[PDB]
Every structure is written in C-alpha cells, then in structure tokens.
Specification:
This is part of a larger assembly, with 9 protein chains of 7 kinds. By secondary structure, chain A is mainly α. In chain A, 93% of the residues lie in helices and 0% in strands. Chain A starts with a helix and ends with a helix. By secondary structure, chain D is of the alpha+beta class. Chain D is elongated and about 40 Å long. Chain E is mainly beta. Helices cover 0% and strands 49% of the residues of chain E. Chain E is built from no helices and 11 strands. Chain E has a 4-stranded antiparallel β-sheet, with no helix packed on it. In chain E, strands 5-6-7-8 form a 4-stranded antiparallel β-sheet, with no helix packed on it. In chain E, strands 9-10-11 form a 3-stranded antiparallel β-sheet, with no helix packed on it. The radius of gyration of chain E is 13 Å and the shape is globular. Chain G has 8 helices and 19 strands. The two termini of chain G are 36 Å apart. In chain G, β11, α5 and β12 form a beta-alpha-beta unit. The relative contact order of chain G is 0.13. The longest helix of chain G has 18 residues. Helices cover 27% and strands 25% of the residues of chain G. Classes of the chains: A mainly alpha, C mainly alpha, D alpha+beta, E mainly beta, F mainly beta, G alpha+beta, H mainly alpha. Chains in contact: A-B, A-C, A-F, A-G, B-C, B-G, D-G, D-I, E-G, F-G, F-I, G-H, G-I. Chains G and I meet through α6, α8, β18 and β19 of G and α1, α2, α3, α4 and α5 of I. The PDB classes it as ribosome. The entry lists the keywords ribosome, ribosome biogenesis, rRNA. The entry is titled "Cryo-EM structure of the 90S pre-ribosome (Kre33-Noc4) from Chaetomium thermophilum, state b". Chains A, B: Utp2. The organism of A, B is Chaetomium thermophilum.
Chain lengths: 46, 61, 66, 48, 114, 96, 389, 33, 91
C-alpha cells in the first residue's frame, strides 16, 4: 500500500510542478520581452 | 447473480475431506481486498500525512 | 532560587555533554550494516526511501464493477 | 529604554529574612523606542 | 377549473387542486397560499392528506401518485404503480390500530392498491 | 531604461526559489520594484549562493544586462550599499 | 495553564484571539448551570478538532466533565505536506457529526479571519452529516453567500485579496431534524495571506446606499417559493429603490448515511445593499424553520424589514461583520485604525471581545463622536511563520 | 356581502454579468465598479 | 444625559460589570420590526436620509504618522494613559 500511495504522490507532484513552472516562465518572458521590444522600437526611432 | 458470477470468490473443488453430519463460500477475496484497503488507508495514509505533526487533543471524559 | 534553577540546568548540560561524547548511534551514523545494527530496529523504525517499479495492479471491487 | 538610574526597593525585614530573595528594582530611564503598552508589558534585560 | 379539494383533519389548512396539473394549498382561516404543488404532466384526479396532516398523496391521470409532506410540501416519493389513471386515494383517519399512514389507491383499470 | 544608468529598488517577493535545478535562470530571476515609478520588473543575480544574499526588503541596485529566459534585461550590482561581487568574493558583509 | 477565562460565551472568538496571539489560556465553567448536557457541545469539539487540524503544535486538554479546557496554541500552518497533508495543495477534510446545530458560518468566520495568518494556503473541505449551508434560527447564524458578499469585501478592503480568495460550495443543506443534521459540503481555498494587514480609515459617511442584491435559496423545495420570494421582496423594496436584484437557487438533495437519507431541506433568503462610496454594505437573512412551514412571502418581507433595520442602524458595517473587522484592525500594525460605527450597533459580544483584548493585553480603543468614531490601537503581530528566501 | 379573493393572474433575475460577479467562488472586491 | 462616548468608554472596561448590564446601563421582535417598517412615514424619512512614487508613498506614510496623535489627541486618561500607553520621548 505504501508503494502505490507514494508513487501516486510522485506522479501528481511532478505534474503540478512542471505546470507551475511553465506558467511562471511564460508569463515572465512575455512581460520582460514585451517591454524589451518596446524599448527596441523606441531607441530604434532615433 | 451470486451463483453465476462465481469468480467473485474462491472455493475448494473437493468438498470436505471427511463428511461429518451435525445440525459453498469459504471466503470473499474482493471484500477482503476492499476492507483491507479501507483499514490501510484510514491508518497508514494519515500516518504518512501527519509524519511530523506535533500537537493533538487529549480528551478524558 | 536562581542558583537552584541554574543547577538543574547544569545537570542537564552534563547530560547533553555525555550525549555528545557518547558513541554515535546507528541512525545518526550513516553506514549501517547488519553487523553494526541490532536485531529488528527496522521493525521498530520510521524511514522514508525510494521506490523503483510499476506496482502490481490490484483487482478491486469498483474496478471489476467498471 | 536605556536605563538611566538603578535603585533597589525591598523591605529591610525581607532582606534580613532572606539575603537571597525576590527584591524589587526601580529604574529611571527615557522612553526611546516606540510606546509602551498599557498593561501586561513583557521585558527582557541583558543577561538578566 | 378545480378538480379536487380537501380540508385538513385538523381544521387548519385547506387545499384546492386545479385543471392546470397544479395544486394550491391555503390556510383554513384566511385563504392565503401556504404553498403549491406541481410535477404532474396531466391534471390531478384526487388527493388525500394524513389524519395528523403530516402527509399528502396526490394522484393524477399520469398513472402515478406523489407523496408530499405538508411542511415545505416536499415530494417524499413519486410512485408509478397503476397501469391506468388512478381516480382516487384515501387514508384511514384512525391510527388506533397503528396503521394510519396506510392508504388505498383506486384506479380505472379496475384495481385498488393498499 | 529610464533616464539614468542605474536604478534603485526593493525586491518584492522571490519567485524561483522553488526552482528545481541548481543554477537555472528561473532560479536566478528575482522580482524588483522600480522606485522612481513603482514598477514591477525582473532582474538577475549572477550566482545562486548570492541570490542567498539578496533578501526581501533589502535595498537593491539594478543595472543593465550585456551579452534560458532569453531577454531578461536587468542585473544587480550593489546590495544595500555594498557591491554584489564584493559580497560574493566575501570582502565585506551585508549591512541591512 | 497561564491565562484563565470562564463561562461559555464567545467560545470561538476567544479561541481565535488566543490562537492569533499565541497566549496559553484556561477556560473554565462551560455549562455550570445546565446539568442536562454538562460541559462541552458537539459543535465546540468540532471546532476544536478543526483548530488542531488546521494548526500545528497546539495542545488541548479537556476535563473529565468537559466543563473546563486548557489550551496552548501552536502555530498557524494552513496546508503543509509534512505536517498537515500529502501535497502542498491537498484539500484537508473536516467532518462534523449529525449532532450539530450551529451554522458553518459560525465555524467559518473564525477560519476566515484565521487563515490569512498562516504559513501557506488554506485548502479546507467540510463534509459530514451535520453541515448546514443555510442560516440558522439558533443564535442567528448567517448564511453562506451572506458570509461571502458580506465579509470578503472587508478583506479586500484590508489588503487581503478577494480574487485569491477561492471558496466554493458543492452541496447545500438546511437543518432538517430539529437543529441537528445538515450535510451539504464546501471547500475554502485561501490563496491570500499577508504579513501585516493594512491600517485603514473608514470614517467618511456612507450616505447613498446605491443598489441591493440578494439570493433566495431552496435546499430541496420547488422554485415557486423563491419566485414568490422575489415578487414579495420586490413589493416591499420597490417603493424605495430601483436596482434591486436577486439570484435564485434550488439544490435537489444531500444524502448522508445512517443506508443513506436526504436531509437539509428548506429555503431561505439573504439580502445585501451595496454603497456608492467604498466597501460599505448591509446584509440580512431569514430562513424557514426546518420543521415549520411558513410563508415565503413572510420570509421575503421579514428579511426586507431586517435589512431596513440594519440600514437605519449601521455606521459602517453590520454588527455580525463588526467582530471580524475589529479583530483585523486589532491584528493591524502599531497604528491607530479609524472606523465609523453607529450608536445602536453596539453589542455585548463586541464589548466582551474588547474585554478579552484587554485580557490578552491587546490594546485599547478610543471612541469619540462624529454615531461614533472608534479608533483601535493595532499591534502588528502578524503571521508568525512566513518564509523569505 | 360575500368575501372574494383572486388568484386568477419577477425581475430579480439580474444579468449574466451580475451572475458571474455574485454567485461565484470568486467574491466581488470592494474597489471595483 | 443620553448614551455618551466617555460614559461608554468608562463602562467598556469594567471588570465589576457584565457586558449586558453595562449596555443596559449605558443606553437605558419580528412583529415589532414588522410594525416599525410597515409604518410608511418612518420608511419615507429613512428614504430621505439614506438615499515620484517615492514621495507619494512617503506622503501617505506621514499621513499615517500624523493621523496617529490626530486620533488620540482627544482625552488624557482614557487615551494618553490607557489607549496609547506611555509615549516615547518621556522620562
């Protein structure tokens, strides 16, 4: 019983894990690169 | 349905080795697995979840 | 009064000092083999470890019903 | 409070009764941090 | 149009029961709507409430009966038990035998059920 | 950015100390707040055991980024009035 | 074992304050009068198991008579995978037996002003036979969406984020057999904790009450009742104000074991008025008694009238909301917190609560006039165990 | 003179927006409009 | 002499008095409210009567800094002794 429970816990944990981090990485990349390309267009204007 | 799904359970094909008269299911594997699952949950899982939990209620009444 | 509390404390200190100068036991040592550890301390113990494999499927009530 | 002045208050009968006993201490000081409480103030003192 | 109405065995409630497959229960003193029962697809044929007014049975031409409660009027049980349109249903008022919540349902296909 | 070379900030609340691998840039990101506006921007720290020096609500100074979350812009030089490379060569300890 | 209290009044809030300061208490003489059911009550032992479940390191000793408890609090975790649960985000179960009559709001406002002081998220799921999602006749416990649309606004004012409150229902329930029973199940997720709630100033007059919403809910009856409830409360308040609007609800049935029975059947009404200026609202509830059978229009007019009563009464918030917001201002930083109450809104419960503030050493209140202003001296305790990496 | 009563004959339904701001597990804040 | 602020502040923390007795001393069901809000003139009277980020942050915090002492600049014993404790700068 320990075996089936522990390993089910590992599975659920890893799924939540990689989901959480791909969320945060995508949001952060979008924001920082968003304003970065904005600064690119602004400096490129002059 | 009991009689005609008989691989719910396990039975010796012999009958009794000796026939005594003084006045067939010898078990239910699925029910044993069920109830053992229930007990193993209600103890071992909550132990695994409160591995290191300090503090409880002591109640004398 | 304060000296008496301090004396209780100092007896506790020499107890913990005896602990630190003791032989390290078999759980806080790292290398435990059957020669060093006594009879059934596992049976008494509370470890967590790693599991490798796919578990043996269980043919349960509601599964067979499914 | 940085303590400004140390003073001992104890009944001399209690001093002659027990040379080691729960004396009382007056301490003059300034209110330096933020405010005290109204009642139930808890204090630690350096090595005390 | 109303198809059936009754009193309450304690003279406290009255209940009318209409063509619209609906029932409107009021108080006996002033005729203000205590509640209303629905849930039959065909107009009701009869109704009977318990001697202690703790229970309703409401039988309609949908070939079924509804057991309600008289507080909040909740259907305790829908019962589909006659092969035809039940005309009537009746409780016994005397629970002195210990059977007052027993009742007879009489139906167009020549049968009654206890 | 802005109009000056460096800018000041508080660090808001570290993300990515839940980061699994030791040295990934999603450990080495940190969330700073730009004081001159109140903005929330994203800055780097050049080593894990020095992210350990940046603690929440300690004065943090950021600057550009010149060279795996491609295009973060900001990295952090002086922490609380002492430089990061200084602390991490263990020259002078951290005054809060 | 150090602090001493007595009686059985303000049981939950007393444990709340002992919890959120850490001071160890000893409450005596719960029911010295009632020799019928001497000592504790099942909802009390329910909240006790609840606190031990949500916390860590608290220790409760209960007397052989049950008329006296002593209690040291531990610390406030939430849902933690080593101490509490299996995951980080496991949903930890609280079951409460059928011998329960008090509202889960009476359980819930305590968890409400506890959980933003935790270590991590709050993920607690209430199940069981005695779980009532309706307002109680009782000691007049509130109802569920009442609690929502009433007090969660107050956290959103305090700095405790409403969008990261996540409290949902699954099944609903009234009392059923007497006050005993219930059954409907709920889950509260607080993704909303803070260091130190914002010290505020609710002093401007809440003159223009703008809109009124409500919910008529039917745990197992026909929606004729609530449509009539709509039209009745409409006939009441339509003289007053245009924008009155109300959500209907009907839930079929909860089923709990002895072999299961449907229970929790009934219906009731909650109403709230939203104010134009800021988070100022007024809430009232009326339900049918779980064995009564009274008129839904009577419930509509009665809830309407109680709403008008607290409309006339209120300075900033309703008195049922008052302890929550007062305790939050007490937990606030070493500041003054300024709040505008009305004259009538005073309650001996609030008075005794301020007395318990004095008892724990929590500071005092100033009360001057503009209805009155109360300033409350916050302390700045905050959550104790909160990570900064 | 006889007594007669009549039974021979709702706007609280709000809007979908007011549904999704009022019945959800996501509560309405105090500072929105 | 109606129910008053300072009288309430005295009766509030009174270990010799129960909260119920304190409330009745300070001041003086369903059908009653039903009457009181079936009276239409009462409801109509109620109808009438009821219907540079850095420097900005520092400015708001010094609003806080003055609002305390602005709120307990009212009474000596109840506030300056009992609400706000013993203040800094004093001997």
């Amino acid at each position: 019983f320990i075996r089936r429970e522990q390993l089910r816990i590992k599975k659920e944990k890893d799924e939540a894990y990689e989901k959480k981090f791909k969320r945060i990485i995508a949001e952060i990349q979008n924001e920082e690169g968003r304003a970065a390309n904005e600064y690119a267009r602004e400096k490129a204007a002059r | 349905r009991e009689q005609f799904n008989p691989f719910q359970f396990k039975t010796n094909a012999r009958g009794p080795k000796f026939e005594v008269t003084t006045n067939v299911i010898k078990g239910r594997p699925e029910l044993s697995r069920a109830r053992s699952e229930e007990k193993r949950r209600q103890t071992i899982l909550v132990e695994m979840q409160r591995r290191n939990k300090v503090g409880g209620i002591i109640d004398r009444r | 009064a304060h000296e008496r509390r301090q004396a209780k404390i100092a007896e506790q200190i020499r107890k913990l000092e005896a602990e630190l100068v003791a032989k390290r036991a078999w759980t806080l040592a790292g290398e435990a083999t059957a020669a060093d550890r006594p009879v059934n301390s596992l049976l008494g113990e509370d470890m967590e470890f790693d599991h490798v494999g796919k578990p043996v499927p269980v043919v349960t009530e509601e599964v067979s019903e499914s | 409070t940085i303590i400004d002045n140390y003073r001992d208050i104890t009944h001399p009968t209690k001093i002659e009764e027990d040379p080691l006993c729960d004396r009382t201490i007056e301490l003059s000081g300034y209110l330096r941090g933020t405010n005290f409480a109204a009642q139930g103030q808890r204090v630690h003192i350096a090595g005390v | 149009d109303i198809l059936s109405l009754r009193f309450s065995p304690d003279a406290r409630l009255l209940a009318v029961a209409l063509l619209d497959s609906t029932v409107k229960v009021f108080f006996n003193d002033t005729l203000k709507l205590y509640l209303n029962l629905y849930g039959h697809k065909l107009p009701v044929l009869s109704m009977d409430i318990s001697y202690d007014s703790k229970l309703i049975v409401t039988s309609s031409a949908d070939k079924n009966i509804r057991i309600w409660g008289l507080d909040f009027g909740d259907c305790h049980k829908a019962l589909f038990g006659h092969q035809d349109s039940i005309l009537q249903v009746a409780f016994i008022p005397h629970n002195s035998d210990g059977n007052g919540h027993y009742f007879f349902s009489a139906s167009k296909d020549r049968t009654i059920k206890y | 950015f802005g109009g000056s070379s460096h800018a000041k900030g508080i660090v808001l609340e570290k993300v990515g100390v839940e980061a699994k691998q030791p040295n990934s840039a999603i450990r080495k990101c940190v969330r700073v707040q730009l004081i001159k506006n109140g903005k929330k921007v994203t800055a780097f720290v050049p080593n894990d055991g020095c992210l350990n020096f940046v603690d929440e609500n300690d004065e943090v100074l950021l600057a550009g980024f010149g060279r795996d979350i491609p295009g973060v812009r900001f990295k952090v030089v002086k922490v609380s009035g002492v430089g990061l490379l200084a602390l991490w060569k263990e020259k002078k300890e951290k005054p809060r | 074992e150090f602090l001493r209290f007595t009686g059985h009044r303000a049981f939950t809030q007393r444990l709340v304050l002992a919890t959120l300061y850490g001071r160890p208490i000893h409450i005596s003489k719960i029911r010295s009068s009632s020799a019928t059911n001497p000592g504790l009550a099942p909802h009390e032992i329910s909240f006790l198991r609840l606190l031990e479940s949500v916390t860590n390191g608290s220790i409760i000793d209960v007397s052989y008579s049950g008329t006296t408890i002593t209690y040291q609090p531990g610390l406030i975790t939430g849902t933690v995978p080593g101490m509490n649960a299996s995951l980080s985000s496991d949903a930890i179960e609280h079951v409460i037996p059928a011998t329960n009559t008090r509202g889960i709001t009476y359980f819930l406002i305590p968890l409400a002003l506890l959980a933003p002081f935790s270590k991590a998220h709050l993920n607690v799921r209430f199940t069981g036979p005695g779980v009532i999602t309706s307002a109680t006749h009782g000691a007049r416990d509130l109802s569920i969406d009442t609690f929502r649309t009433a007090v969660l606004p107050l956290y959103g004012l305090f700095g405790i984020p409403p969008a990261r409150i996540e409290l949902r229902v699954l099944q609903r329930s009234c009392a059923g057999p007497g006050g005993k029973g219930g059954g409907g199940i709920v889950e509260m997720r607080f993704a909303s904790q803070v260091r130190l709630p914002k010290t505020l100033h609710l002093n401007r007059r809440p003159g223009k009450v703008r809109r009124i919403r409500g919910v008529a809910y039917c745990t197992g009856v026909a929606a004729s009742h609530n449509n009539r409830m709509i039209t009745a409360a409409r006939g009441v308040l339509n003289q007053l104000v245009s924008d009155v609007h109300i959500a209907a609800q009907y839930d079929p049935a909860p089923l709990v074991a002895e072999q299961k029975k449907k229970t929790g059947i009934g219906f009731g009404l909650s109403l709230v008025a939203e104010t134009s200026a800021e988070g100022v609202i007024y809430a009232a509830d009326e339900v049918a008694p779980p064995e009564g059978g009274v008129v839904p229009e009577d419930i509509g007019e009665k809830c309407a009238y109680q709403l008008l009563d607290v409309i006339a009464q209120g300075g900033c918030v309703m008195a049922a909301s008052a302890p929550t917001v007062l305790t939050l201002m007490a937990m606030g930083s070493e500041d003054v917190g300024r709040l505008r109450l009305g004259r009538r809104v005073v309650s001996p419960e609030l008075l005794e609560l301020a007395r318990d503030l004095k008892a724990f050493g929590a500071a005092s209140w100033g009360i001057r006039d503009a209805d009155l202003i109360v300033s409350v001296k916050g302390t700045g305790v905050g959550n104790v165990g909160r990570k900064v990496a | 003179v006889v007594q007669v009563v009549d039974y021979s004959n709702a706007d609280g339904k709000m809007s979908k927006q007011e549904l999704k701001v009022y019945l959800s597990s996501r509560p309405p804040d105090p500072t929105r409009k | 002499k109606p129910w008053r602020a300072i009288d309430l502040a005295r009766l509030m923390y009174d270990t010799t008095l129960t909260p119920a007795q304190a409330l009745r001393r300070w001041r003086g069901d369903y059908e009653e409210l039903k009457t009181k809000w079936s009276n239409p003139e009462n409801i109509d009277a109620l109808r009438r009567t009821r219907f540079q980020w850095y420097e900005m942050q520092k400015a708001m915090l010094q609003k806080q800094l003055d609002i305390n002492k602005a709120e307990y600049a009212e009474l000596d014993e109840h506030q300056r002794r009992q609400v706000e404790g013993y203040r800094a700068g004093k001997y």
